[PDB]
Ligand binder design. Structure first.
Ligand SMILES: [Ca+2]
Ligand SMILES: [Ca+2]
Ligand SMILES: [Ca+2]
Ligand SMILES: [Ca+2]
Lengths: 551, 551
C-alpha cells in the first residue's frame, strides 16, 4: 500500500530559470518546515522534483483540528479528549492538511498558491489513491443490483462531500426514473403516440421528483453535519483588489459582464446557421446529417467552453461560489442551446409550415413522423457517444502514451498518476441535467425512449466510478451543502417541459386551441406544484365577609 | 387617573344559583390569594360583583418576569438586576399578569377560564383605559399630516403588537397608495378609459408594494425583539381530548371540515339568486338596486358570519393560531364572494352576451358604460356606509342606552366600560384587504377612483383610533410576529387582479386575442415578481543538499 504519504507536490524545474528554481525550492522547503510538516524529496520525470509532505507532530494536528471544530461551532455549522469520541475521518484530515498548505502567512499557514504568488514553478498538489481499496470498491459495486446508504457513506468518508452528493443525486434519479419508464411503456403499447395524459403524468412526475429530492437533500445535509456550510464565505486567492478588507468597484464587474450578450448572439448565429443548412440539406436529399452533427458537436463544444472559461477568467469575482455559479450558468446555457435548438427547429418550424435555402440548393446542382424517427438516433447515437469518448478511448490513449531504488514501483505509480488530469464533477451534473431535460420536455414524442435512459443510468452509476477509479487522479476533498445552482436549472427545465409538451401534442395532431392547451397545462403544473409543496411540509377574612354582606 | 387597578373581573351572579355563586366567589378568591395578587371587592350593576386585582409583592413579579425572559431565551425569541437596564413596559406587564391569571394550576397559575372549567359565572377580564393619555393621543394625531415611527412605537408600548402591526400596515398602505392615484389621474386626464398600460402599472405597483411590505414587516419584527414568536405553540384551553400530551384523532377533524363544501354551495346559490334577480330587475327597469343591496348586505353578512363562527366552533383545533387561520379563511371567502360576485356578473356576463328571467318579469306585469357608472356608486355609497355604521351610530346607540362612596365617578366609569364590546382587529384587516383587492383588480375600469381611496385612508388611520378611544374597551395585549394569514390573501388578490385587468381591458373594447392578452399579462406579472424578489434581496540541512546535489 501507500508509504503514509499525505500530499505530493510536482514543482517542475525549467532549465532557463535554474537559479530562480533553486530559490523557489529553498523558499518552499523553509515554508513547509516552519509549519511543522515533515517532507521528503525524490526523483521526478521530465525535469520535475516530486516532494512528499506528511504531518509529523500529533499535538499540532490535534490543535488544528480543535481550532477548526471551534470555528465551525462559531458559525453555526456544528452544534485532545474529544477526538476519541468523534474519530477523525480521512476526508477531513486531508482537507485540513490541504487548507494548512494553501492558507497564507497572515492566517498561520504558508500560502503556496501556484498562480497568483511568486511560486510560478509549482503546478499541482494531489493526494495518492488506495489501489486495494479501489479494487475492492469496484468489485463490490459490480455485484449488487441496488446500492444501500452504507456505500454512499463510505464514498463520502473516502472522498468528501461533492462526490457523495453527486452519487446520491444520481441514485435518486435512477430510482425515480422507473415510473416514467412504466408509463411510457403503457402509453406506447396501448394509447399510441402523442398522448396528452402521458404529458400530464410526466409533468407531475417531474414536480414530485424535484420536491422529494430537495427534501432528501436537506435531510442528508443535516445528517452528515454539513448543513449551513454555504452560509460562510471563502476568499478567492485570485481575486484582485484596488483599495483597502479588499474592495473592487462594481463598475468594472458590470462592464465585463455586459460583454456576454455579444457572445450569446454570436454563438446563436453560428449554431443556427449550421442547424438550418443541415436541415436544408436533409430536406433536399429526401446518414449524412447524423454523422455531420456527431463530428461537429465536440469540436465546437470545446472552443465554446474555452471561450466561456476565458471570459469568466476576465471577470473578477470575490468568493469562489459566485465564480462557480457564473461558470455553471454559462455552461448550461451553451449546452442547452447546442443540445436542444435542433429539436426546437425540427418541431416548431418544420411541422407548422414548410425555400429561401431550398431554391439555392436546387440551383447549386412534411412528414409528422420526422420528430419520432430522428429522436431514435438522437438518443441511441448520443448514448453510444457517451460510451465512446467518456470511457474506452481515454484509457486507450493513456495506455498508448505510457507505452534507495528499492521502491521503484511506487515511484513509477506516482509518476504515472501525476500526469493524469484533475477530475471535475460539474460535467456529470451537466449530463444528468440534460437527461432530465430530455425526459421532461420530449418524452411525449417517444414514450418508450425513457425506458432506455433507465438502462444507461444503471451503467453510469458504475461507469463514472471507473472514471474516478483509473482514468483520473484523486480529487481534492471539499465541503458543500447543496449540489449548487443546478436546482434552478432543473426547475426551469421542468417549467419549459410543462409548456412544451402540450404544444407538441397539439401541433403533432387552430391558434386559440393551442393557446388554451398551453394555458391549461401551465396552470395544472402550477397547481400540482403548490399542492405537492403544501403536502410535503407535513411529512416531518375581610373579603369573605364583604361578599357575604352583599346579600 | 386610575387607582392603580391592573385587572377587573365581572363575575355576574344569577339569582337561581346563589349558593353556587357564593361557592364560585369563594373559590376564585382563594385561587387569587394563593398566587399572591391583592384583590378588592366593590359594588356592581345588574347583579354583578366587580373585583379589582393588582400585583402586590414586587419580588414575585420580578421572578415571574425573569422566568418569562429565560423561557423566551430558550426558544430563540430573545438573544432582579437586569430590570433596570431593560425597563418593564406596560404591555408586557399586563400580558404577564393576564397569563398568570389564566394559566392553570399545573403550570403555577390558577386557571379561571370562563367557559371550559366549572367557573361558569365569570364572563370578562379587561383592563382600564387611561382617559388623559387617550385624549392626548387623539389630540396629537389630529394635528399632524404624517405619522413618524415614534407614534407607532408608543402605540406598541401602550397596547401590544397586533395593534402596532395593524397601524404600521395601514400607514404603509396609505403611503404607497399615492402612486396609483397619480397614475390613475394621468390616465383619466389624457389616455381615457380602459388603458392597458394603466393595468400593467397597477400590477407592478401591487407586486412592489407586497414585496416591500414583507421586507419592512421582517425589519419591524426583528427591531422590537418579537421575531420568531410564532415558532412556539400555545395550547388552546377549549381543545378537547380523548386519550393520553392530549391527542385528538384526525378522523373527526376531517369529517367536520368536509362539511364546509355544502355550506359553500348553499351560500353560492343564495347570493347568486339575489344577484341575478337584482340584475334582471335593473335591466327590466331601464335607485332601487343600490338601496336594495345596501339594506340586504348587513343582514345576510351577520347571519353568514354567525354560521361560519358556529361551524368553526364545532371543529376542534389544537393551537389558537390554526383556529384563527381557519376563521380568517372562511371570513375572507365569504366577504370576497359577497363583495365581488356582483361586479363579476356585471362584467363577464352582461357585456359578452345578453332572457330566461326577462321573459318571466315581462309576463309578471348592453351599454359598456354600465361597468363605470355603477362602480361610482359601488365606491361612494360603500364609503358612506363605512362612515355610517362604523362610527356615528355606535356612539349614538351607546349614548341612548346610557341615557366609601367618595369615588362614585370611578365606579360609574368602570360600570359603563364593562358593558362595551371587546375590540377585534381582524375586521380592519378584512376591510383594508378588500380595498387593496378593489385597487388591484378593478382600478382599470375607473382610474380616478383610486384617488378617492387615498382620502378615505387619511380618515381611517384616525377614525379607527377613535373607535379604540371611546366606542370600545381596552384589548388584551398579545404577542405576534406577522399580520397573520392575510399575506396569502393579498398574494391571491394580486394574481387575480393581474388576470382580470387584461380581460376587462380586452372585453370592454376574438377569443384567441383574449387568450393571448391573458397569457401575456400573467407572464409579465410573474417576470416582474421574480425580478423584484431578486433585487430586494441585495438591499440588506539534508534536504537542501539533496536539492543542490540534483544538479
Ligand atoms: Ca453515459
Ligand atoms: Ca459521465
Ligand atoms: Ca372607513
Ligand atoms: Ca374600520
Amino acid at each position: 500500500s501507500n508509504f503514509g504519504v499525505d500530499f505530493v507536490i510536482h514543482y517542475k524545474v525549467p532549465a532557463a530559470e535554474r537559479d530562480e528554481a533553486e530559490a523557489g525550492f529553498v523558499q518552499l522547503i523553509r515554508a513547509l518546515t516552519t509549519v511543522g510538516l515533515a517532507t521528503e524529496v525524490r526523483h521526478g520525470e521530465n525535469e520535475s522534483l516530486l516532494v512528499f509532505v506528511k504531518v509529523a507532530s500529533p499535538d499540532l494536528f490535534a490543535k488544528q483540528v480543535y481550532r477548526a471544530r471551534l470555528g465551525d461551532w462559531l458559525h453555526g455549522v456544528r452544534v485532545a479528549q474529544a477526538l476519541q469520541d468523534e474519530p477523525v475521518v480521512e476526508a477531513e484530515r486531508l482537507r485540513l492538511i490541504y487548507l494548512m498548505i494553501t492558507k497564507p502567512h497572515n492566517e498561520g499557514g504558508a500560502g503556496v498558491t501556484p498562480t497568483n504568488a511568486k511560486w510560478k514553478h509549482v503546478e499541482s498538489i494531489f493526494p495518492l489513491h488506495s489501489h486495494s481499496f479501489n479494487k475492492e470498491w469496484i468489485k463490490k459495486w459490480s455485484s449488487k443490483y441496488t446500492l444501500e446508504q452504507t456505500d454512499i457513506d463510505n464514498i463520502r468518508d473516502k472522498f468528501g462531500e461533492s462526490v457523495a452528493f453527486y452519487f446520491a443525486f444520481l441514485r435518486s434519479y435512477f430510482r425515480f426514473l422507473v415510473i416514467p419508464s412504466a408509463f411510457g411503456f403503457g402509453a406506447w403499447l396501448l394509447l399510441g403516440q402523442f398522448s396528452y395524459l402521458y404529458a400530464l403524468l410526466c409533468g407531475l412526475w417531474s414536480v414530485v421528483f424535484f420536491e422529494y429530492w430537495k427534501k432528501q437533500e436537506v435531510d442528508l445535509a443535516v445528517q452528515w453535519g454539513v448543513r449551513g456550510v454555504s452560509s460562510i464565505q471563502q476568499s478567492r486567492p485570485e481575486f484582485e483588489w484596488e483599495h483597502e478588507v479588499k474592495v473592487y468597484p462594481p463598475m468594472k464587474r458590470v462592464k465585463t459582464q455586459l460583454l456576454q450578450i455579444p457572445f450569446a448572439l454570436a454563438c446563436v448565429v453560428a449554431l443556427g446557421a449550421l442547424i438550418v443548412t443541415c436541415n436544408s440539406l436533409e430536406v433536399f436529399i429526401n446518414f449524412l446529417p447524423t454523422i455531420f452533427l456527431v463530428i461537429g458537436t465536440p469540436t465546437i463544444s470545446g472552443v465554446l467552453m474555452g471561450a466561456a472559461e476565458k471570459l469568466n477568467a476576465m471577470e473578477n469575482y470575490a468568493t469562489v461560489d459566485a465564480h462557480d455559479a457564473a461558470l455553471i450558468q454559462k455552461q448550461f446555457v451553451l449546452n442547452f442551446m447546442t443540445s436542444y435548438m435542433a429539436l426546437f427547429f425540427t418541431a416548431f418550424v418544420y411541422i407548422p409550415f414548410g425555400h429561401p435555402f431550398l431554391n439555392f440548393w436546387r440551383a447549386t446542382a412534411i412528414n409528422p413522423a420526422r420528430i419520432s424517427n430522428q429522436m431514435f438516433y438522437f438518443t441511441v447515437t448520443a448514448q453510444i457517444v457517451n460510451f465512446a469518448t467518456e470511457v474506452v478511448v481515454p484509457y486507450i490513449k493513456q495506455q498508448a502514451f505510457q507505452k534507495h531504488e528499492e521502491e521503484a514501483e511506487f515511484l513509477q505509480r506516482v509518476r504515472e498518476e501525476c500526469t493524469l488530469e484533475e477530475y471535475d464533477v460539474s460535467g456529470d451534473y451537466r449530463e444528468m441535467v440534460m437527461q432530465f431535460g430530455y425526459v421532461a420536455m420530449f418524452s411525449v414524442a417517444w414514450p418508450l425512449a425513457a425506458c432506455c435512459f433507465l438502462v444507461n443510468n444503471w451503467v453510469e452509476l458504475r461507469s463514472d466510478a471507473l472514471k474516478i477509479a483509473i482514468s483520473s487522479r484523486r480529487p481534492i476533498p471539499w465541503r458543500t451543502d447543496s449540489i449548487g445552482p443546478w436546482l434552478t436549472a432543473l426547475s426551469f427545465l421542468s417549467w419549459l417541459g410543462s409548456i412544451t409538451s402540450s404544444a407538441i401534442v397539439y401541433l403533432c395532431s387552430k391558434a386559440w386551441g393551442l393557446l388554451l392547451s398551453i394555458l391549461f397545462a401551465e396552470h395544472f403544473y402550477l397547481v400540482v406544484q403548490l399542492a405537492v409543496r403544501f403536502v410535503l411540509s407535513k411529512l416531518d377574612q375581610e373579603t369573605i365577609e364583604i361578599g357575604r354582606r352583599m346579600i
